[model samples]
Target: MHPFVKALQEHFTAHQNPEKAEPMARYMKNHFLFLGIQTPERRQLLKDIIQIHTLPDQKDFQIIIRELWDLPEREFQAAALDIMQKYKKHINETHIPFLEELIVTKSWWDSVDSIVPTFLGDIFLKHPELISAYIPKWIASDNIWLQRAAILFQLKYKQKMDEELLFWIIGQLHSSKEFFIQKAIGWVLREYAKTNPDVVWEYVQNNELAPLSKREAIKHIKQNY
Candidate 1:
């Protein structure tokens, strides 16, 4: 284990809360284990370690992050995300494989949502060329989580959002009955609505969308607009 990873595992393992673990695991449908560490406490616990440790290269980062992801505790994956965000500057095209691996493995909204906007989105924004190569492929994937990530990678783009691509991806998946996919479509539309409400409103009115999607897409618009 990398020294930083070793320290993190030691600290997190020592603080395991069995009382909290069962509930947290149940919340996630018992898909993974947990140390029962809440977000705020986990963040506080690791703030110092994050400050002291550094990931200087892609290889080192991949090694540490994959190790963290492979651990049983959901918090370990969360911690890996925090670590990835800190070293995002060191990321490059070569890291796309690693990012994809993280997305598809031990996948869930909790991890996928964070990884898409915080990590994959940043990479796509920095390397626009990657958009054609990866996002489209993910959009076409059988994995609903990948499709969700593809739709939402631009969630934080605001003005930088590729409006055409966003619309196209939504159109491609608008017919999806999958709850997550429907929710993602609404989420991306809703976020974009913050900047372009008229466009989203018109689109939602004219298009066939799942009820969940339409509801999520228009939530903010109905409240504020």
Candidate 2:
């Protein structure tokens, strides 16, 4: 292990897992073998642990921060902007094995959700050609998180959105009963709705979207209606 990772391990162990059972529950439940450090310490430890050049974790999220955190705010607006830029070429042909590892390893709704939209979405925007490969493969993955990621990786594209592609991917996942997938599909459409409400209503009405998906798609829209 790199000196930095070791130091992080030592610090976390020294602190005796400052985070509580509920919040730190992912570590134990997913068998990540964490020391259960709290939020402040977690960030501090990551700061120290970044020295290891070869990715201490499966997804190598640190690379994203180190390369882009210093970039101008507008440039690094998305969470995975740096990684997406660095791997722009690879994303087109690569399945991002690391993403799969992250999805299953120490996985949870919170972490997976952020990575799917922020990281993967940014990747697609930077490299459109990858969509053909990226969409089909992820949608076919047995991993629910990966499936959800497929539907949501374009969440922030807005008017730049590819309507046919979005609906195509959604169609592939229409029968999912998983809460996360349903929520993600709806969330993606709903986010798009903010850009065009009528489009969303028409799509939802025309196609047989899951109840959860329909509810999620319009949940925030009907707040006053």
User: Cα RMSD (Å) per model?
Assistant: 2.1, 7.5
Q: Estimate each model's TM-score.
A: 0.91, 0.71
Candidate 2 has an lDDT of 0.64
Off by over 4 Å in 2: 16-19, 23-36, 48-95
lDDT of 2 by residue, 46-114 (tens): 444454443344355444444333333211223233234444444532445556555554455655665
Best-performing candidate as measured by lDDT: 1
Model 1 lDDT tens row, 46-135: 886766774446658888899899888899999988878778778877888888899999999999998888778888877888788987
lDDT values of the candidates?
0.87, 0.64
How big is the RMSD of model 1?
Answer: 2.1
Evaluated at residue 103, the lDDT of candidate 2 is 57
lDDT for 75 in candidate 2 is: 17
Question: Residue 40 error for model 1, in Å?
Answer: 3.4
Q: In candidate 1, how many Å is residue 53 off?
A: 6.8
